[PDB]
Each structure stands twice: as structure tokens, then as C-alpha cells.
């Protein structure tokens, strides 16, 4: 019985940690694409001004 309870509690904690990890993980590539767009905008603005 102790083995069964330990297994189910481990599964519950693993699922909650997975949720927190994926929600924290999906942030950084958005900022990377944002600054790639910023660099393209800067180059286009310089060429347009010239």
C-alpha cells in the first residue's frame, strides 16, 4: 500500500511540475523574433532615409 501511494503522489507532482516548466519555457523565442524584427526594421529605416 505504501508503494502504491508513493507512486500516485510522484505522478501528481510530476504533472504539476511539467505544467509549470512548459508555461515558463514558452517565452524566450518570442523575444528573439521580436529583436530580429527590430534589426530588420532598423536596416530598412536606414536605407529608406538614405
Amino acid at each position: 500500500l505504501q508503494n502504491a501511494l508513493t507512486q500516485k503522489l510522484e505522478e501528481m507532482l510530476r504533472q504539476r511540475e511539467d505544467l509549470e516548466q512548459v508555461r515558463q519555457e514558452l517565452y524566450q523565442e518570442e523575444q528573439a523574433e521580436i529583436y530580429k524584427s527590430k534589426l530588420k526594421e532598423e536596416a530598412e529605416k536606414k536605407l529608406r532615409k538614405q
Binding site: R23, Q24, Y27, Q28, E30, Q31, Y35
Partner: protein, 426 residues
């Protein structure tokens, strides 16, 4: 349950404050229309701290925008997140203050603040249990400092057992964008000493130098400077809205940093500012942030902490880190560096950790420090005011609006009292 009221006054206050609402709405998941398009159940759990409710699943900020020139808030209303505020909370005049402190306190601001506090009264009575207030201004102008210190003393009498948060930009030595800048700084700090529980010092000179030696910025416009200030404003008050292992609210930071009621001026900072030359090669560890905290370049004022001594230092962490690693790192900074801290206070260093870092960043923290090095910022203002006061230069319209000559001498005596108490406790 623990609500804060935000007030924006002056051009410097409004531009910083308008970026502040764009930063925290991204962390809470609010679209510019005002609806909740959020991703977590933890973001909406503590949202009544800064926001009031609307009709139709929308959230409005608990902010009041006040300025004597309508042209400034026309830029704010036309901005990215300008459609979130209440139009009733916009309180404006028609005749500008002219960057003259006697106008914004006696003859021009004295007719508007009847209508300013009625917005403040009905936005602060609607709370269930109010914690404190926030107000953004600068110590160089006649609008940020004229009406800014008047708004504090009217609500300090109204709400005595509360806490004031003023995030003040101090005048710089070498920038000098105003001719009468040493006058109205001394006149405004005469009221911030007696009536504010927490005052922050921010220098435009230091904010420039951070952008070059650390971020390696090419063109640091005024958008990027407010991005540095608004991140420090959010890091201070993150224990109210996010769960943490060792949390510390605003009044928790009121007791530990202020030993005597005269010294509540803090130099703040931010932990993981990094340039993209070395962003992708950087290592992120708790010992790595601690190197970047106590750097005097990372501080946002033109005071060198090695020309003084520290009283109390706190650092509010954000993310998922180990709390043993936090405290032995923050004990090592006190054991080995013993001269720069005071002797009659054991364990100068306080810590706090929350579990929610800012977006797009694994680990982050904010720095707040109390030092005796801040006397030089006050000493350089007191000597610039002394030189012009001998010849009575630029002073004859302040006297023309009902403000006597003895009022300027009273401010200088109270200003030199603050310099003496920093050296006495050194």
C-alpha cells in the same frame, strides 16, 4: 486585500508611469483593449492589487494622471496602452507651471488639487484594505516637484497610518537641463523628508552610463531609460502578487531599511541586465547575479558607495533557485567586505525570493541599498543653491507669488541637517 494607488504627476512622472503599465500588463496578461487574455491561473489570482474591475471582462488600472499641460497626456492617450485608463481620472489645467515651483504650489496647483483628491478619495475608499500609495515625479521641475510634494502632504493628513512610495528622479551634476534646477530640488526635498516613508533616487547620468558599459546601447532614447526604471518598480512589489518561499511586502521593507525616521532614501538597481554581445555566452547562477548586484555602475545614482558606508541592503530575487545558495552568497559579501558596511549593525544584508521571474528571463532580481554615499548627491545640490542664493539670482518671481525670502533659508537649514546625520552615523 492589499491595494496600491498610483499617481502620475509631471512630464517625467507620466512618461515613466506610462511605460510602467505596459510592463506589468504583459506579466499579468491584459491586452491594450483591457480584456484579460492571460495564460495562467496564477496571474489573475492577485490582480486587485493594481487593477479595478470594469464591465465585460475588462480590467482598468488604479491610476490617476495629473499634469498642468494637456499636451503631455495627449501623447500618453495616443500611445500603445493608452486606451486602458479611465477618462474621469484625467485631471488637467490650461496654464502651464512654467517650471517654477512657486506656481505649482501656491497660485496654479492650488486650484487643481481640489479636483485631484476627489479622484484619489473615491479610488482609495473603494478598496477593502489599503496598504499604501505610489507617486511618480522628478526633483528638477516645477510640475513634478511643485504639485508632487503638495499631493503627499494632503493625503498624509488624510491617511496617516499608511506608506508612501515616491520614485523620484534626482537632478544630475553634469547634465543640467534646467537653469533653476538647484532651487526647486531643495524646496521639494524639504517636504519629502518629513512626509514620505520611502523615496527612491534615480539619476539620468547614471541611467545613461548603464546603457553604455553594460547594455552597450548605440542610441539610448527616452524609451529605453523608462524600461530600466519600470522593471525596478515591479521587482519591489512582487511579493504582493506572486507566491514565494521567503516573501516581503512593502511594509516589510519599511521596517528593515529605516533605522531612524530621517534616512529613507534608497539607491536601487537591477540584476541581470546584459548585452547581447555576451548574452548568449553568459552563465546564470546565484553567485553570478551577486557579482552584478554590488557593482557601483549598476546603481542608478551618481554616488560611489566606497565613498561611504552601507546601512541596510536587500535583494528581492525572482525565479526558481536554492535558498542556501542565496544566503551564503549574501553572507560572503559581508564577511570579506567589512569596511564598506557599518560596524554597530550585525547582518546588514536582507534577502527575499519569489517563484515568478519576469517574462523571457530564467532568473532575475532587483537590488535596493541604503548607503551613506548619498550625502554627496545632497551636498552638491546644497552648494549649487548656496552660490546662487548669495546674489539672489532668478529668485524674484518666486517672491512675486507670495513665497517669502525666509522660506528658502528654512529649506537650506533642513537640507544641511540631512547631510550632517549621514556623516554622524558613518
Amino acid at each position: 486585500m492589499r491595494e496600491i494607488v498610483h499617481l502620475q504627476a509631471g512630464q517625467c512622472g507620466n512618461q515613466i508611469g506610462a511605460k510602467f503599465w505596459e510592463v506589468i500588463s504583459d506579466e499579468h496578461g491584459i491586452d491594450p483593449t483591457g480584456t484579460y487574455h492571460g495564460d495562467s491561473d496564477l496571474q489573475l489570482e492577485r490582480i486587485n492589487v493594481y487593477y479595478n474591475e470594469a464591465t465585460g471582462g475588462k480590467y482598468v488600472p488604479r491610476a490617476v494622471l495629473v499634469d498642468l499641460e494637456p499636451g503631455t497626456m495627449d501623447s500618453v492617450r495616443s500611445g500603445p496602452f493608452g486606451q486602458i485608463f479611465r477618462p474621469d481620472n484625467f485631471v488637467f489645467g490650461q496654464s502651464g507651471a512654467g517650471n517654477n515651483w512657486a506656481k505649482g504650489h501656491y497660485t496654479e496647483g492650488a486650484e487643481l488639487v481640489d479636483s485631484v483628491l476627489d479622484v484619489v478619495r473615491k479610488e482609495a475608499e473603494s478598496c477593502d484594505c489599503l496598504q499604501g500609495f505610489q507617486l511618480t515625479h522628478s526633483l528638477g521641475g516645477g510640475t513634478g516637484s511643485g504639485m508632487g510634494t503638495l499631493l503627499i502632504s494632503k493625503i498624509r493628513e488624510e491617511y496617516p497610518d499608511r506608506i508612501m512610495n515616491t520614485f523620484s528622479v534626482v537632478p544630475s551634476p553634469k547634465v543640467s537641463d534646467t537653469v533653476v534646477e538647484p532651487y526647486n530640488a531643495t524646496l521639494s526635498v524639504h517636504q519629502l523628508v518629513e512626509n514620505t516613508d520611502e523615496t527612491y533616487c534615480i539619476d539620468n547620468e547614471a541611467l545613461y552610463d548603464i546603457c553604455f558599459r553594460t547594455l552597450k546601447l548605440t542610441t539610448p532614447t527616452y524609451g529605453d531609460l523608462n524600461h530600466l526604471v519600470s522593471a525596478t518598480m515591479s521587482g519591489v512589489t512582487t511579493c504582493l502578487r506572486f507566491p514565494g518561499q521567503l516573501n516581503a511586502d512593502l511594509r516589510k521593507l519599511a521596517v528593515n531599511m529605516v533605522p531612524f525616521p530621517r534616512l529613507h532614501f534608497f539607491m536601487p538597481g537591477f540584476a541581470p541586465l546584459t548585452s547581447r554581445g555576451s548574452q548568449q555566452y553568459r552563465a546564470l547562477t546565484v553567485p553570478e547575479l551577486t557579482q552584478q548586484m554590488f557593482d557601483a555602475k549598476n546603481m542608478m545614482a551618481a554616488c560611489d558607495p566606497r565613498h561611504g558606508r552601507y546601512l541596510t541592503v536587500a535583494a528581492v530575487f525572482r525565479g526558481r533557485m536554492s535558498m542556501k545558495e542565496v544566503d551564503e552568497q549574501m553572507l560572503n559579501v559581508q564577511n570579506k567586505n567589512s569596511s564598506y558596511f557599518v560596524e554597530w549593525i550585525p547582518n546588514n544584508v536582507k534577502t527575499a525570493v519569489c517563484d515568478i521571474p519576469p517574462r523571457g528571463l530564467k532568473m532575475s532580481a532587483t537590488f535596493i541599498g541604503n548607503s551613506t554615499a548619498i550625502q554627496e548627491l545632497f551636498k552638491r545640490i546644497s552648494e549649487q543653491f548656496t552660490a546662487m542664493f548669495r546674489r539672489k539670482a532668478f529668485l524674484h518671481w518666486y517672491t512675486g507669488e507670495g513665497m517669502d525670502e525666509m522660506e528658502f533659508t528654512e529649506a537650506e537649514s533642513n537640507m544641511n541637517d540631512l547631510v550632517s546625520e549621514y556623516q554622524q552615523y558613518q
